[PDB]
Amino acid sequence: MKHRYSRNRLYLNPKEQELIKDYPILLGGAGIGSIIAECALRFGFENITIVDGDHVENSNLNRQNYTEGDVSVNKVEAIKARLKSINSKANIKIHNCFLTSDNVEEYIKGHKVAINALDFSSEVPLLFDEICQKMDIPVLHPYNLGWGGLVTIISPKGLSLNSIAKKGEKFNELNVVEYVSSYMRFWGKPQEWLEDIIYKFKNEREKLSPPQLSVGSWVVAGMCTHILFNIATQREIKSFPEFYLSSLEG
Amino acid sequence: MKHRYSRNRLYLNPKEQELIKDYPILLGGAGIGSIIAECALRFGFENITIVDGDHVENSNLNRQNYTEGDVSVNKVEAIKARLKSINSKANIKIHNCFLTSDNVEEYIKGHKVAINALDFSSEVPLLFDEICQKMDIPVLHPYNLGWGGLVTIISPKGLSLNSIAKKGEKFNELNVVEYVSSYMRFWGKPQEWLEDIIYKFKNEREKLSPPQLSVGSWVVAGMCTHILFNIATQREIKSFPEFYLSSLEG
Ligand SMILES: CCCCCCCC(=O)N[C@@H](CCCCN)C(=O)O
Ligand SMILES: CCCCCCCC(=O)N[C@@H](CCCCN)C(=O)O
């Protein structure tokens, strides 16, 4: 293995390090995804495509991979600068574009795995998954539950997130999180912290974006890197409606 | 709360955000601690002292908070640059020196909590904890278990790591990790992945440094930030001999 991956030994053999080096990852969303990209790059995944159309905002600094100097810059330009300072020989391809129903299929082509970190206020979070399923591309959905990291993998031949959507209202991250907490309580392991923050968020007078913490960003980035390593080396993983939830109490 | 910590709301109230802002943290060791430092800084902990005498090497980039440009610079110089580019008004005090029996007490004095990330090949890992107990400074011990993050907190009036050290034989991180695996198995939760890497590492022909992965580093950084927040806000915590273990498998 290379001197950069020296301490990866025993956990990974030389042939696995080689395999994940060129494994093409598609990253939709450079918010929580900017933390995921660094952890995955340092692990050894050197072929990452990042698509995001937002700019770096002040409020990102509590949980995303940007600096004071990055504010007002395209997230994709900023995270590529960061990633290429970690690994100059890395293959980091960025696109400062929003995903739409018209362009999303062309971006997906050519990748072996995808990470759906798209805001539900755009238009294509679920269509993205539908297209990936058609192409044998498993999809990681990472969520920042503040204290917890949540990941579920949409597998090509399995259920989609549609199963938790009601046909009359739009579907966002609050539906996934309400699904997860309800699942946990039903099966005898309630996450009262998660139920508490769901309750607090719903009863807010003003309508704001969900809160997120650096802890959940860092934990979910670790989970994704492990899941990516498992998919690339064809080790077993749980697919939706199953999920991975990781927190200080677990 | 500044607009930088805007998305921290509900999880933290404004009075909690202010408290951790000036909460003096001592971080001994800027390796795994460099990942911990960023996650805690973005969370709102703005008063961090970092002590480490090593320089940045190539093998650090697979799991530590450094870049190719940082290589050959004092780890403490690199991590202060990284952190201060995230938050210019942060109070980041560094010391480019190894801790010894003579200097370790004066570094500890003045902090409310400490993170002992000191290599067990130095002379002061256990003495570091003893002084903190004498001063009512709880000590977090974070460990990188590859796929897992492990944190144990030494509380001032509780058991120290001495309890698992053997009178007469040398004590290193493998003793801590072997206690955790044995403890988990004792309780019917064997971590066979963890037991596997211990076996592989012990039966290594050559004597090398333990492997570590970016996955555990990112996970343990999140755990430490949650634990730090709980200690500052006087929320209950688990003390050694109990510990926190977090992995995808759990
Ligand atoms: C009230 C507590 C619930 C918190 C909601 C989760 C918010 C979140 O994790 N949002 C990601 C987008 C990923 C979505 C993938 N379908 C981001 O803002 O990057
Ligand atoms: C064979 C598997 C066992 C792995 C050993 C754990 C190594 C580790 O986590 N070492 C930290 C130092 C923190 C120590 C705190 N008392 C570092 O190298 O930063």
The helix or strand, by DSSP H or E, that contains position B152, with its residue range, turns out to be strand B148-154
**Which residues in A7-22 are b (16+ Cβ under 10 Å) and which e?**
bbbbbbeeebbebbbe
Amino acid at position A18, single letter: E
Say yes or no: A80 contacts chain B, CB-CB below 8 A. no
Residue B87 placed within a domain: yes
3-state secondary structure of B113: strand
The helix or strand, by DSSP H or E, that contains position B163, with its residue range, turns out to be none
What is the residue with the minimal CA distance to atom 10 of ligand 1? A143
Q: Comparing C-alpha atoms, which of A204, A187, A205, A185 is closest to residue A195?
A: A185
Q: Take residue B54 and report the two structure tokens written for it.
A: 């090593």
Neighbouring C-beta atoms of residue B83, cutoff 10 Å? 24
Q: Evaluate the CA torsion angle B170, B176, B181, B185 in order and state its sign.
A: positive
Residue B108 placed within a domain: yes
Helix axes B192-202, B173-186, angle to 10 degrees: 140
Kindly provide the resolution of this structure in angstroms, with one decimal. Answer: 3.0
| Gap between the Cα atoms of A35 and B65, Å rounded | 12
Contacts of residue B48, Cβ cutoff 8 Å, sequence gap at least 6: B25, B27, B37, B40, B41, B83, B90, B91, B92, B93
Residue B199 placed within a domain: no
Amino acid at position B224, single letter: C
Number of domains in chain B: 1
Q: B139-145 and A25-28: which strand pairing?
A: unpaired
| Gap between the Cα atoms of A163 and A171, Å rounded | 11
Q: Which residue has the tokens 């199953």?
A: A242
Residue A182 placed within a domain: no
DSSP B34-83: HHHHHHHHHHT--EEEEE--PBP-GGGGGTSS--GGGTTSBHHHHHHHHH
Say yes or no: B204 contacts chain A, CB-CB below 8 A. yes
Q: Take residue B203 and report the two structure tokens written for it.
A: 């039966």
| Gap between the Cα atoms of B31 and B50, Å rounded | 10
**For ligand 2, is residue B32 a contact (CB within 6 Å)?**
yes
| Gap between the Cα atoms of B79 and B68, Å rounded | 13
Q: Comparing C-alpha atoms, which of A107, A128, A140, A109 is closest to residue A229?
A: A140
Residue B179 placed within a domain: no
Residue B113, beta-bridge partner list: B25
Contacts of residue B74, Cβ cutoff 8 Å, sequence gap at least 6: B52, B53, B54, B55, B56, B96
**Which residues in A153-175 are b (16+ Cβ under 10 Å) and which e?**
bbbeeeebbeebeeeeeebebeb
Contacts of residue A173, Cβ cutoff 8 Å, sequence gap at least 6: A120, A143, A210
Say yes or no: A236 contacts chain B, CB-CB below 8 A. no
The minimum CA-CA distance between B3 and chain A, rounded to whole Å, is: 6
**Please, is A68 exposed, middle or buried when counting C-beta atoms within 10 Å of its C-beta (0-12, 13-18, 19+)?**
middle
| Gap between the Cα atoms of B219 and A247, Å rounded | 9
Contacts of residue B206, Cβ cutoff 8 Å, sequence gap at least 6: none
What is the residue with the minimal CA distance to atom 13 of ligand 2? B117
Q: Which residue has the tokens 């995270």?
A: A79
Contact between A215 and B44 under an 8 Å Cβ cutoff? The reply is no
Question: Are A69 and B88 a contacting pair at CB < 8 A?
Answer: no
Q: Comparing C-alpha atoms, which of B145, B129, B117 is closest to residue B239?
A: B129
CA dihedral A48, A51, A54, A60 (to 10 degrees): -30
Q: A148-154 and A244-246: which strand pairing?
A: antiparallel
B225: DSSP letter: H
| Gap between the Cα atoms of A158 and B34, Å rounded | 40
Residue B117 placed within a domain: yes
Contacts of residue A212, Cβ cutoff 8 Å, sequence gap at least 6: A32, A62, A63, A144, A146, B7
Question: Are B8 and A213 a contacting pair at CB < 8 A?
Answer: yes
Residue A8, beta-bridge partner list: none
Assign residue A19 the CATH number of its domain. Answer: 3.40.50.720
Residue B71 placed within a domain: yes
Task: Give me the phi and psi of A47, to 5 degrees please.
Answer: -120, 90
The helix or strand, by DSSP H or E, that contains position B18, with its residue range, turns out to be helix B14-22
Neighbouring C-beta atoms of residue B126, cutoff 10 Å? 16
Residues of the domain holding B31: 3-157+212-247
What is the residue with the minimal CA distance to atom 15 of ligand 1? A117
**For ligand 2, is residue B141 a contact (CB within 6 Å)?**
yes
| Gap between the Cα atoms of B174 and B164, Å rounded | 11
Structure-determination technique? X-ray
| Gap between the Cα atoms of A178 and A52, Å rounded | 26
Question: Are B58 and A204 a contacting pair at CB < 8 A?
Answer: no
Closest residue, chain B, to A69 (C-alpha): B85
Residue A181 placed within a domain: no
* End-to-end Cα spacing for chain A: 32
**For ligand 2, is residue B165 a contact (CB within 6 Å)?**
no
| Gap between the Cα atoms of A114 and A48, Å rounded | 10
| Gap between the Cα atoms of B38 and B200, Å rounded | 32
B238: DSSP letter: -
DSSP chain A: --GGGGGGTTTS-HHHHHHHHH--EEEE-SSHHHHHHHHHHHHT--EEEEE--PBP-GGGGGTSS--GGGTTSBHHHHHHHHHHHH-TT-EEEEE-----TTTHHHHHTT-SEEEE---TTSS-HHHHHHHHHHTT--EEEEEEETTEEEEEEE-TTS--GGGG--TTS---HHHHHHHHHHHHHHTT---HHHHHHHHHHHT-SS--PPP--HHHHHHHHHHHHHHHHHHHTT-----TT--EEE-TT-
